[PDB]
Design a protein around this ligand. Structure first.
Ligand SMILES: CNC(=O)c1ccc(CNCc2ccc(-n3ccnc3)c(-c3cn(Cc4ccc(OC)cc4)nc3C)c2)cc1
Length: 183
């Protein structure tokens, strides 16, 4: 899978106005203040979400995302046609293929309804591999010699796909450090 690595970048036309992007486009975290920027159709107005720039309509692709220290997060890939505006469900049935950490140590998966996870080694880095023809997306624990964490399947896929991120709320003030796309 490592042999399908692709360069991903944060598209700032989607980013929630509370989110701070690095100047290299390799980092997202939540800023304590808001930002004045356009009201455009592509932006997530409610929830702290941002997309990858690159559209995929075929082939095998793979990236890695550091999450060292973080007490929550959401990683995945989604259809280009997903809603951006208002309140909704992270679910495969709504075209979101995702996993998350919430409540400090509670790992879970975007089935409807949602499927908890049982991991022996808490992941510090996470591999995401999409194979568009196969209709699959997969997720690996880098810290634990690359063990498989969960894998969507029989996905169909008809339109363009997008990498998908969220560094989580810091409701507690202890989830401040960012998602950093690693090499
Ligand atoms: C934020 N909190 C809630 O809204 C909430 C909503 C419902 C529940 C009820 N139990 C199911 C359950 C548990 C956990 C989660 N979750 C938490 C983090 N990621 C996923 C979800 C979930 C979340 N979304 C959308 C989303 C994702 C991230 C985000 O920013 C960080 C904002 C919006 N959709 C579902 C479905 C559902 C618990 C918490």
């Amino acid at each position: 899978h490592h042999h399908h690595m692709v360069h991903i970048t944060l598209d700032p036309d989607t980013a929630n106005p509370w989110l701070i992007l690095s100047e290299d486009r390799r980092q997202v975290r939540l800023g304590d203040t808001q930002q004045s920027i356009p009201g455009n159709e592509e932006r997530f107005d409610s929830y702290p979400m941002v997309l990858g720039a690159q559209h995929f309509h075929s082939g095998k692709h793979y990236w890695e995302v550091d999450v060292t220290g973080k007490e929550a997060w959401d990683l995945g890939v989604c259809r280009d046609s997903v809603r951006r505006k208002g309140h909704f469900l992270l679910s495969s049935k709504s075209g979101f293929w995702t996993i998350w950490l919430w409540n400090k140590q509670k790992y879970e998966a975007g089935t409807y309804p949602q499927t908890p996870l049982h991991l022996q080694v808490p992941p510090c880095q996470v591999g995401i591999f999409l194979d568009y023809e196969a209709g699959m997306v997969s997720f690996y624990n880098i810290t634990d010699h690359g063990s498989l964490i969960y894998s969507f399947s029989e996905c169909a896929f008809t339109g363009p796909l997008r990498p998908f991120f969220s560094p989580g709320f810091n409701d507690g003030g202890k989830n401040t450090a960012p998602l950093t796309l690693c090499p």
